[PDB]
Amino acid sequence: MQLTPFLILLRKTLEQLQEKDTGNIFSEPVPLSEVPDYLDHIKKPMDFFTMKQNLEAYRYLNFDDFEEDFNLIVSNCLKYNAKDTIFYRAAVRLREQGGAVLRQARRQAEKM
Ligand SMILES: CCOC(=O)Nc1cc(-c2ccc(C)c(NS(C)(=O)=O)c2)nn2c(C)nnc12
């Protein structure tokens, strides 16, 4: 498999995932200034902007590493927030809608 089409695919996939985050709550890192206790149990913060930077730094060279960081966006949010919050439900919805996006993209990658 060749690097350029793979990265093209990840760029598109990231945009597609970002589209699911309609509230844009996962677009940027959790503001430690607004949420001071955040790092106390979240050992690897993640967000779509950071994923973009990792992508263009050639840090995602296979689908799994890409999907791992997406999954962190979701699990960090589920971990930090109580179940009866908008945040927690947004992460569930992202997991759900994101999963379909990722499966389709992976099958595109396996044709390469
Ligand atoms: C007991 C309160 O718990 C929380 O405040 N949790 C969370 C809070 C925020 C959050 C707050 C305030 C602001 C201003 C932002 N800004 S932004 C541009 O990232 O949307 C984000 N994100 N977040 C994410 C993801 N996951 N959990 C949380």
From Swiss-Prot:
> Coiled-coil intervals in this record?
none
Localization per Swiss-Prot or TrEMBL: Nucleus; Chromosome; Cytoplasm
Q: In which tissues is it expressed?
A: High levels in testis.
**Domain called Bromo: residue spans:** 1-105
> What span is annotated as the signal peptide, if there is one?
none
Provide the record's note on post-translational modification. Answer: Acetylated by KAT6A.
Q: How does it assemble?
A: Component of some HBO1 complex composed of KAT7/HBO1, MEAF6, ING5, and BRPF1. Component of the MOZ/MORF complex composed at least of ING5, KAT6A, KAT6B, MEAF6 and one of BRPF1, BRD1/BRPF2 and BRPF3. Interacts (via PHD-type zinc finger domains) with unmethylated histone H3 at 'Lys-4' (H3K4me0). Interacts with trimethylated 'Lys-36' of histone H3 (H3K36me3). Interacts with ING5; interaction directs BRPF1 to H4K4me3-enriched chromatin at the 5' of active genes. Interacts with KAT7.
Indicate the disease this protein is implicated in. Intellectual developmental disorder with dysmorphic facies and ptosis: An autosomal dominant neurodevelopmental disorder characterized by delayed psychomotor development, intellectual disability, delayed language, and facial dysmorphisms, most notably ptosis. Additional features may include poor growth, hypotonia, and seizures.
Q: What does this protein do?
A: Scaffold subunit of various histone acetyltransferase (HAT) complexes, such as the MOZ/MORF and HBO1 complexes, which have a histone H3 acetyltransferase activity. Plays a key role in HBO1 complex by directing KAT7/HBO1 specificity towards histone H3 'Lys-14' acetylation (H3K14ac). Some HAT complexes preferentially mediate histone H3 'Lys-23' (H3K23ac) acetylation. Positively regulates the transcription of RUNX1 and RUNX2.
Give the protein name, as stated in the record. Peregrin
| Species of origin | Homo sapiens (Human)
